[PDB]
Amino acid sequence: QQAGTATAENHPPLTWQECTAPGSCTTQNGAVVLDANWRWVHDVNGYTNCYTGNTWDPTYCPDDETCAQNCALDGADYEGTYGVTSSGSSLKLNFVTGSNVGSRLYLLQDDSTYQIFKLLNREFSFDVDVSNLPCGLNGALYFVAMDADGGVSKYPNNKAGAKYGTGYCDSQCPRDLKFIDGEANVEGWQPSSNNANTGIGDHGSCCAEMDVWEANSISNAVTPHPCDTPGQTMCSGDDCGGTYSNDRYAGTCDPDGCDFNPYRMGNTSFYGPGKIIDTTKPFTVVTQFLTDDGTDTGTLSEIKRFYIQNSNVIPQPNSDISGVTGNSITTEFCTAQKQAFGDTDDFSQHGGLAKMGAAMQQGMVLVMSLWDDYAAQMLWLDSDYPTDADPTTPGIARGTCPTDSGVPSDVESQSPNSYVTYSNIKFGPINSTFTA
Ligand SMILES: *[C@@H]1O[C@H](CO)[C@@H](O[C@@H]2O[C@H](CO)[C@@H](O[C@@H]3O[C@H](CO)[C@@H](O)[C@H](O[C@H]4O[C@H](CO)[C@@H](O)[C@H](O)[C@@H]4O)[C@@H]3O)[C@H](O)[C@H]2NC(C)=O)[C@H](O)[C@H]1NC(C)=O
């Protein structure tokens, strides 16, 4: 895709901190950029639509290559069009703004380069306000093994780059992306039956995904998802797997992950409104990526979680599922959890924590987003899922929401002023971001 010119692009600033020891942090002057797939796609010459609703113009885009030559990703009016604002260390994402729904943003090192985090033997902390996230919404903060440059050095017809939010990938091998690897996705494009603004093409973009935080005011989950190739790779057709292919398990990435959602793990009193972590008020989320020998070059062995609210440091609760022990993500936990819930162990099939850690070694990009779910209504996060199962069976109940909740047309109509706010990002050695 070309770099658009109809609307100017300026990346909202966002500070964050690097910490060297507890209480000892310094400030980085970061910025964020909107993902390419939210942008208007305009023909380079006339400023008319290359893509309208969910179909492509056949003169500008007769095939994938020609489309990428003829079409540009426009700049973004962050506040006015997308409901994205920042101030200091805080980033606020609004849900509905005009015809726009949600957003996905990446943290930048500079105007052409995503900030790469090396998570092994490190800790990442952030503050969040989920108080205005109801059933069906997901304020997600997570890492994916994207290329720092957004693909530009590999794909000459990607002239837009990280400056325009190119290069996304995740463990669903998303095929909804209009441009992947310097090519459009018009060949094979199929408009979404239930979304006027989206579709699915033949190409998908796969990479490992560390879902630090997927949450609303009802439930949260922390979930690593390994892929056979850790970094970004293109797939084609239904062999992509992931949510929107015919068979979600047909591909090279684990679409389910090894998840810890305290409600799903049998403690419903831990997280939610007025609960031990009270989602009506902001709180701090700390995540540690421990290695087997405690060094930077060890193998990822354990992912731990702490929360801080009203200055109280609160560990993740223990699993209360028979067969599944502890409060952290380890190989033993993951094997046991899949067995207890009767879920296919795709995590182990795609290399588990060893392959997740290999992706961490490659370096990962920080994503902050807000979305609703046109496949499964976020029921997997906050309801009883699958909806036909007995909610008392282990693994089924994930939150309090009814199974008819989270339909996009309902939540976009009823909760347009919902938002998520992320703030006070801190990153450094284990124990450096909080009072351990
Ligand atoms: C859902 O998960 C939460 C979070 O883990 C869990 O709450 C925790 O419950 C335990 C048990 O009630 C609490 O631990 C006790 O806390 C009190 C007060 O601080 C202490 O006096 C206790 O100390 C004694 O017992 C310890 C062993 O448990 C001994 O090591 C010690 O020497 C003392 O004899 C004890 O630590 C804990 O404080 C809460 N945590 C929070 C943050 O509220 C809850 O039980 C889970 N709910 C369900 C339904 O499963």
Ligand SMILES: *[C@@H]1O[C@H](CO)[C@@H](O[C@@H]2O[C@H](CO)[C@@H](O)[C@H](O)[C@H]2NC(C)=O)[C@H](O)[C@H]1NC(C)=O
């Ligand atoms: C990070 O801090 C934690 C908590 O203080 C350290 O773990 C404690 O370590 C001692 C052993 O040295 C144990 O007796 C405690 O039970 C641990 N507590 C918990 C909650 O795990 C940990 O060692 C520190 N990590 C590093 C690398 O310094």
